[PDB]
Design a protein around this ligand. Structure first.
Ligand SMILES: Nc1ncnc2c1ncn2[C@@H]1O[C@H](COP(=O)(O)OP(=O)(O)CP(=O)(O)O)[C@@H](O)[C@H]1O
Ligand SMILES: *[C@@H]1O[C@H](CO)[C@@H](O)[C@H](O[C@@H]2O[C@H](CO)[C@@H](O)[C@H](O)[C@H]2NC(C)=O)[C@H]1NC(C)=O
Ligand SMILES: *[C@@H]1O[C@H](CO)[C@@H](O)[C@H](O)[C@H]1NC(C)=O
Lengths: 1028, 324
């Protein structure tokens, strides 16, 4: 809806070209970063517990709660800050490169940031683009210049764009000559593939040429130009409105199933850290009830504290028994669980097995967050054409007028013309050595293999397409006759319609309207009396498992053309809903076509596309298939794909059974309850259509007693493999939703190949884009990508699992690490006068959560395979089933806890009984209370670690160095901190505690035991699980 | 083409320990052979240590010195008879327990100024704001400020041996070397410089409750100021209500006589420390010492309760597995 002028002068009101990819700045970093952290629960809560320590008079010095909180920040800010600064220095490059402009007959050399909207740009070969231009001319005629979008969506070929006819003449011919134009384009939409515009070039005196535009004229900002000398563009979008720049945002998907549990535990602890306070406050003011039991003449209450309002004092305590138990919320989890993902996401991008030789590229992880979401999928929505069958079509066994050509020249000769026209082959322009090859270079470059196999087909017969020469088309009809054809309108294909067409003008006569498309969408518009003659053939060729396509021509009368022509073009200059308003202009152009003959193309399966789908099943998933081809075809490739065993009682809902409005439901409820409700197991699979489906969902609001849909969905959950044929481009989305929104939240993993699937990949929990032959429209939106389908096995099982059992046993341990460390300090608030006397020291309250026992859980997080990565992908029986999120469900969670409590108690009561002795050393001396801290601590750091050394089932050389590299650290720290660190301290309370807690040979036997009795409830499950 | 490094492929050189029943069952039967030979190894050296705790708190209408449980002339004098059945062989230690004396009380553990006792001259004249309730009396600085050092257990015990005649032989007690040598020469030091331990304390005074200045706790210069063992061992907090702190140790005479010959003795305690107020008892635990420490059964009954409940499930496991 905007407006532009080539030279900015007609016959700043717009954005400025400076791409700022960053989020922070050099000034608002802190006030932004911090807030974006302290809005998180555990990083904010620990803040409150800081203030409360700086104002109130509380037991533990502010250090033991501000350091382990100032650190976890400074180590996230830096990374989360620096990791950003990479962009600035990156950005500054792109938008500070040289790009010449044309002010007034001048080839100025400005900075790419200086460009404004509506101004001529210049570009040599090999150079990136300054912004979204509109190709206006090139050095040569033909107004053509290829492009290689190798940085926007990852494409690696040389697409070819087009210039504007009325301007191709302009090349160095001072286009600056107040060149008139009006470039109206829809406000920048990030679709990156649609572009509706217009030009209103003005001639010398008067001219209003309404030269419509299109995506074939836009040159994105970042598509390296190739195979040309130079061009001249007219900027339309100028950065931060350009199509590319808009595509930095996809974050509305990273809500894993292991990121809310982490929020269902805290909400528990935050509701346990109170009980631990309330239950331990009341007991105090009920204990102090005794008159002498407080300040019994040997600790006289400081006079001031005596005259304090009781109720108030009843507060400062309850605020003390949070500052004293606050450690019961893991402070350093919001750095590990992130440092893990970052340092441990590449693994899905390096694994060699995700590397096809041909495509000469590997896997690609376009989301560093959904990793853990792979060992969760419960529905897998594959796509038949493109994933299950590579796009290498081979035209075989056509059928003209039901005669199955191998009629002579009355209509057949025409048919061939149909095959060779009405397409977008665009044969390889360059010429190679012809005479040694079969025919010539003759390499066809197109996106829809459904036709590239046709042309190659006709090439096996007389006719052959070799043209598109200067607005015409060339063909060889069994002899030496170029036979130029004048192309007039190439009606692009559109899935929602299933028909592409071409309106050519017979070089020496009238016009023609060729067209092709799926039978179910070409037959409705035909001289019906000819359908049955060829219908049976299209059945067999499909019944056997070949793609099918019908083709028919309709001669137009010239007197009728002008109506169409006008009606056609005028249906383009519309800037609002062009594709729709256009689609509908020629949807009534294919009124009645004289069908000529049908065609059949065969397809191939992938390497293991038949072995994988035999694995997934064994893994518990419920694989679906959302094809678009004819029903019969899908039913054929399915058997081969091996998702329909020999004995499977299908429940088809095809048009061949539901040719009515009400009939289906009758058939629906029958094969649901009386057929699949009264009851190897796989005996039943489903099959639907693009029509039979829409009736169900859209028209469900009638039988509110037993709604159609609510019935239909019921069958889904109870069918291990289902099909969907004749699927539109959007109905491949309503399906996902219709499933995602039922009985919980089944994690739906969809997998597409091309543009058709963009409507679900962007919709399912975790897409999987297969970068195949069509294009990267699918692999650029998908969270991940794998240049095959055989990889979707090694992806889900061998990674989706480890990327779960590597965290499920982190968010668990990272809590159980604390609920033990802070249990004693709660019991020891029983054998003290409830005066909140921290059992441990302070030097052992900061360290323990960042230094003593931080790494050993990180190590086990990045690199570990509790089941060898080979035995896990070579055995999908349950290893993708044993974890249906069960690793964090309410069952296991409160086992660890009821493992902390026990392993917690034994720490204290295990020690208490040990200090009924009156001495432990041999010299007979006594042991203070601090020596009651290190004991019940040194017996802690040796359990919360060893309890790991009983879980790591994959001992690399790192684990050996971390675990035994924290313990042999602790036993050193206490030795150093123990010794002389006096000068700046104020207590010298742990001056020699440790060194004496080890010279008592009768102490180890308490440690060496208290460890065991704490692990003995873990050494058992091993036995009770390795026995059966 | 992709990096075939040992790590990135995610197949680093592993250990892969196969933890299975058939290879873990011995895990039970390997300890049972190694704990029990300790659980019993210790339990022997526990019941072979004789002790005695002569509760002399009072509160007993028939208690020999209830007479001064109530406020009487300061220098009270108790006398308690008691009989030793099995004479003590080694060198015996004499503790002095307590009870319901919450020496671990956050409001009572902060009550020491650790940087003063260390001998920091400047810190002396003006102790911290932690030993508040007993910081300055008569607006003056206190040398061992703070409740902890204030309420220093201040009654003198004594043990007499009654021979055949009625004259009781006095048993010789020793007091030096009853505190961790680590925190008796490093963590507690007198004021910076001086010659007589009095001058060094110029502006300070004695605590409130005490009866004599810190520079008069003992004549022996090696034990007088802030070094008094009695004082030191009273500062390291109790670590529990029911505690007991070393008081004096009897060095085993070189001869081959029993350091404590059996029979009845006399224990006359100069009762000064009153604990009847908070309902706290008092005692005097005599004891020997073995490498394990002091008589304590737990370690014994624990090992033998683990070294014989792990070594049993293995049976119920070994027998259950083969029968399936
Ligand atoms: N050049 C062309 N000529 C005739 N028909 C065409 C065509 N290009 C596409 N079609 C029609 O478009 C339909 C595309 O099928 P649909 O997209 O529903 O499933 P699909 O098999 O193409 C899986 P995918 O979308 O991944 O390629 C085909 O049925 C075909 O008839
Ligand atoms: C020994 O210490 C105890 C501590 O309670 C004390 O009761 C004894 O008598 C105290 O003397 C202090 C004054 O010199 C002072 O604490 C108080 O007068 C008196 N006790 C009371 C009731 O406070 C101390 N005895 C000795 C030997 O001084
Ligand atoms: C204990 O003290 C008393 C105090 O009278 C004194 O006679 C003697 O030293 C000891 N024995 C007796 C007789 O009490």
């Amino acid at each position: 809806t905007r407006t532009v002028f080539v030279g900015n002068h007609p016959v700043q009101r717009f954005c400025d070209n400076r791409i700022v990819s960053s989020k922070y700045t050099l000034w608002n970093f802190l006030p932004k970063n911090l807030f974006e952290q302290f809005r998180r629960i555990a990083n904010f809560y620990f803040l409150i517990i800081f203030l409360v320590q700086v104002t109130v008079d509380t037991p533990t010095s502010p250090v033991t709660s501000g350091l382990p909180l100032f650190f976890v920040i400074t180590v996230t800010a830096i990374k989360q800050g620096y990791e950003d600064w990479l962009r600035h220095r990156a950005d500054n490059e792109v938008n500070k490169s040289t790009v010449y402009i044309i002010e007034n007959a001048k080839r100025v050399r400005k900075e790419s940031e200086k460009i404004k909207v509506g101004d001529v740009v210049e570009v040599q070969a090999d150079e990136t683009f300054p912004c979204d231009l509109i190709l206006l001319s090139s050095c040569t005629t033909d107004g053509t210049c290829y492009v290689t979008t190798a940085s926007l969506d990852g494409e690696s070929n040389c697409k070819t764009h087009y210039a504007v006819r009325d301007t191709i003449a302009l090349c160095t011919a001072e286009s600056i000559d107040t060149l008139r134009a009006a470039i109206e384009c829809e406000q920048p939409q990030p679709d990156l593939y649609k572009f509706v515009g217009r030009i209103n070039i003005y001639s010398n005196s008067l001219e209003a040429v309404a030269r419509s535009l299109g995506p074939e004229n836009l040159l994105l900002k970042g598509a390296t130009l190739k195979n040309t000398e130079k061009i001249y563009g007219v900027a339309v979008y100028t950065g931060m409105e350009t199509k590319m720049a808009l595509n930095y945002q996809g974050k509305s998907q990273k809500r894993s199933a292991v990121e809310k549990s982490i929020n269902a535990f805290l909400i528990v602890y935050l509701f346990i850290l109170l009980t631990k306070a309330a239950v331990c406050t009341t007991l105090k003011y009920v204990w102090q009830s005794t008159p002498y039991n407080d300040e019994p003449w040997y600790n006289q209450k400081t006079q001031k504290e005596r005259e304090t309002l009781k109720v108030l004092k009843m507060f400062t305590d309850f605020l003390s028994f949070m500052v004293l138990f606050n450690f019961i919320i893991p402070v350093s989890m919001y750095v590990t669980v992130e440092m893990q993902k970052f340092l441990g996401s590449f693994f899905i991008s390096w694994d060699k097995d995700f590397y096809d030789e041909e495509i000469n590229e590997g896997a690609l992880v376009n989301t560093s967050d959904l990793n853990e979401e792979l060992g969760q999928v419960d529905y897998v929505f594959t796509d038949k054409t493109g994933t299950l069958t590579e796009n290498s079509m081979e035209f075989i066994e056509c059928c003209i007028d039901g005669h199955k050509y191998k009629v002579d020249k009355n209509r057949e000769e025409l048919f061939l013309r149909a095959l060779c026209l009405c397409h977008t082959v665009e044969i390889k322009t360059n010429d190679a050595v012809d005479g040694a090859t079969e025919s010539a270079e003759l390499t066809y470059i197109s996106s829809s293999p459904d036709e590239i196999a046709l042309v190659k087909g006709a090439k096996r017969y007389g006719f052959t397409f070799l043209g598109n020469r200067n607005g015409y088309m060339r063909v060889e009809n069994q002899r030496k006759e170029i036979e130029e054809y004048e192309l007039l309108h190439t009606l692009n294909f559109d899935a929602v319609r299933r028909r592409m067409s071409v309106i050519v003008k017979t070089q020496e006569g009238d016009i023609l309207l060729f067209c092709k498309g799926a039978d179910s969408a070409v037959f409705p518009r035909v001289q019906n009396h000819e359908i049955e003659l060829t219908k049976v053939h299209v059945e067999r060729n499909a019944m056997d498992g070949y793609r099918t396509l019908c083709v028919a021509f309709k001669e137009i009368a010239p007197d009728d053309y002008e109506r169409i022509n006008r009606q056609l073009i005028e249906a383009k200059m519309a800037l609002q809903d062009r594709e729709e308003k256009m689609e509908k202009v020629f949807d009534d152009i294919e009124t009645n076509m004289n069908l000529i003959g049908a065609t059949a193309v065969e397809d191939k399966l992938q390497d293991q596309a038949a072995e994988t789908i035999e694995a997934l099943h064994a893994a518990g998933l419920k694989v679906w298939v959302l094809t678009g081809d004819k029903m019969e075809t899908a039913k054929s490739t399915c058997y081969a794909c091996r998702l329909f065993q020999t004995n499977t009682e299908l429940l088809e809902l095809t048009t061949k059974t539901i040719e009515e409005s009400e009939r289906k439901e009758d058939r629906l409820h029958e094969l649901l309850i009386e057929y699949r409700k009264k009851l190897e197991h796989q005996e039943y699979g489903l099959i639907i259509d693009g029509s039979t489906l829409s009736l169900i969902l859209n028209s469900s609001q009638d039988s509110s007693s037993n709604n159609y849909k609510s019935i239909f969905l019921q069958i889904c959950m109870k069918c291990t493999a289902v099909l969907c044929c004749r699927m539109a481009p959007l109905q491949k989305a309503q399906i996902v939703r219709m499933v995602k929104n039922l009985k919980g939240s089944p994690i739906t993993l969809s997998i597409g190949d091309g543009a058709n699937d963009v409507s679900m990949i962007l919709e399912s929990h975790v897409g999987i884009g297969i970068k195949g032959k069509e294009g990267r429209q699918a692999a650029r939106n998908s969270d991940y990508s794998v240049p095959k389908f055989k990889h979707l096995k090694k992806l889900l099982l061998a990674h989706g699992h480890l990327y779960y059992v590597r965290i499920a046993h982190l968010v668990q341990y990272f809590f159980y690490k604390n609920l033990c460390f802070i249990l004693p300090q709660f019991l020891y608030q029983f054998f003290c006068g409830f005066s909140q006397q921290p059992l441990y020291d302070a030097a052992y309250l900061t360290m323990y959560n960042i230094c003593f026992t931080s790494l050993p859980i990180l190590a086990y997080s990045l690199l570990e395979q509790h089941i060898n990565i080979d035995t896990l992908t070579s055995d999908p029986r349950l290893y993708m089933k044993i974890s249906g999120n069960a690793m964090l469900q309410l069952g296991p969670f409160l086992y660890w806890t009821f493992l902390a409590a026990f392993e917690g108690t034994v720490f204290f009561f295990g020690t208490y009984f040990l200090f009924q002795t009156a001495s432990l050393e041999e010299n007979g001396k006594v042991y203070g209370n601090w020596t009651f801290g290190t004991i019940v601590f040194t017996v802690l750091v040796f359990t919360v670690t060893l309890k790991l050394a009983l879980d790591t089932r994959f001992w690399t050389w790192i684990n050996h160095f971390v675990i035994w590299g924290s313990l042999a650290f602790y036993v050193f720290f206490s030795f150093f901190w123990g010794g002389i660190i006096w000068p700046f301290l104020k207590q010298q309370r742990m001056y020699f505690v440790f060194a004496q807690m080890l010279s008592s040979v009768s102490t180890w036997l308490a440690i060496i035991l208290l460890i065991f009795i704490s692990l003995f409830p873990e050494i058992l499950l091993i036995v009770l699980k390795n026995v059966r | 083409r992709p990096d075939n490094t040992a790590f990135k492929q995610q197949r680093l050189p592993a250990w892969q320990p196969i933890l299975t029943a058939g290879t873990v069952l011995p895990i039970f039967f390997i300890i049972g052979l190694i704990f029990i030979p300790i659980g019993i190894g210790i339990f022997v050296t526990s019941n072979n240590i004789r002790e005695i705790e002569i509760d002399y708190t009072g509160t007993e209408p028939s208690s020999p010195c209830n007479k001064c449980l109530s406020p009487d002339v300061t220098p009270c004098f108790c006398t308690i008879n008691f009989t030793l059945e099995k004479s003590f062989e080694g060198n015996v230690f004499m503790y002095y327990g307590l009870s319901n004396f919450y020496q671990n009380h956050r409001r009572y553990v902060k009550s020491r100024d650790d940087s003063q006792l260390n001998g920091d001259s400047s810190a002396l004249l003006n102790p911290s704001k932690e030993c508040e309730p007993y910081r300055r009396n008569e607006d003056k600085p206190i040398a061992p400020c703070g409740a902890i050092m204030n309420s220093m257990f201040n009654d003198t015990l004594e043990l007499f041996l009654i021979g055949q005649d009625s004259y009781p032989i006095p048993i010789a007690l020793k007091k030096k070397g009853i505190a961790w040598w680590t925190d008796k020469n490093v963590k507690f030091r007198n004021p910076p410089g001086g010659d007589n331990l009095e001058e060094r304390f110029k502006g300070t005074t004695k605590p409130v409750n005490w009866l004599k200045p810190v520079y008069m706790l003992d004549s022996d210069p090696d034990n007088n100021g802030f070094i008094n063992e009695d004082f030191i061992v009273w500062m390291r907090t109790a670590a529990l209500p029911t505690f007991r702190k070393l008081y004096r140790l009897i060095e085993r005479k070189s001869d081959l006589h029993p350091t404590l010959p059996a029979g009845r003795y006399w224990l006359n305690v100069t009762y000064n420390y009153p604990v009847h107020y908070f309902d706290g008892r008092k005692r005097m635990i005599l004891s020997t010492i073995s490498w394990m420490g002091g008589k304590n059964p737990f370690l014994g009954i624990a090992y033998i309760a683990v070294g014989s409940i792990s070594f049993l499930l293995g049976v119920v496991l070994l027998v259950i597995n083969h029968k399936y």
